[PDB]
């Protein structure tokens, strides 16, 4: 259920009313729904975290990723 700096995931960003400021913005990466990053550091009660990218390191907020989607890698 947690986020820990260990495991993988996968974005997924899709909200119900997801603004173009978060959407619009990753695609400067190149990065759509359905891409593999992995954790750098997350808290259990809210804090800063990164994400490991294709030679890439973006970071999140514990409220951000309230909108975006995200699926565990294939265990």
């Given at each position: 259920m947690q986020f820990t700096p260990d495991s993988a995931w996968k974005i997924t960003?899709?909200?119900?009313?997801?603004?173009?400021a978060y959407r619009q913005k990753l695609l400067s990466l190149g990065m759509l729904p359905g891409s593999s990053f992995h954790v750098v550091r997350v808290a259990p009660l809210g804090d800063p975290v990164h994400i490991e990218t294709r030679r890439v390191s973006l970071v999140l907020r514990k409220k951000d990723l309230a909108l975006i989607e995200l699926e565990a890698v294939a265990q």
């Open positions: 960003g899709f909200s119900r009313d997801i603004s173009p």
